[PDB]
């Protein structure tokens, strides 16, 4: 949902784990909508 | 095709029609980065007009 925004680290293991997955495969339909470069931006961003 | 004038008749090869339903038949475009049908998924033919 438009709201609940969650995402991941870009280009990292945790997405080829969403990727390859079929069945969560529409997770990652919102994957590329939201990442981020490192974590240390993923975590300052949750923390705002 | 017909393999050869001897050849068994196309019988596991079956024509399925179907209807786009929301929980039970969804429908939706190829994947434009592939060209391909996803790995769940499967291909079928709409005649659009």
Excluded at chain 2, 17 to 32: G, K, N, Q
Aim: hydrophobic share 35%; glycine share 0%; aromatic share 10%.
């Amino acid at each position: 949902s438009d709201k609940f925004i969650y995402a991941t680290v870009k280009q990292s293991s945790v997405d080829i784990y969403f990727r390859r997955q079929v069945e969560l495969s529409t997770m990652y339909r919102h994957m590329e909508k939201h990442n981020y470069e490192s974590a240390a931006e993923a975590i300052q961003a949750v923390r705002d | 095709y017909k393999s050869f004038s001897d050849c068994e008749p196309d019988d596991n090869h079956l024509s399925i029609v179907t209807l786009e339903e929301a929980p039970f038949v969804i429908v939706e475009d190829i994947d434009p980065l592939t060209e391909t049908c996803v790995r769940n998924t499967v291909p079928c033919r709409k005649f659009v007009k």
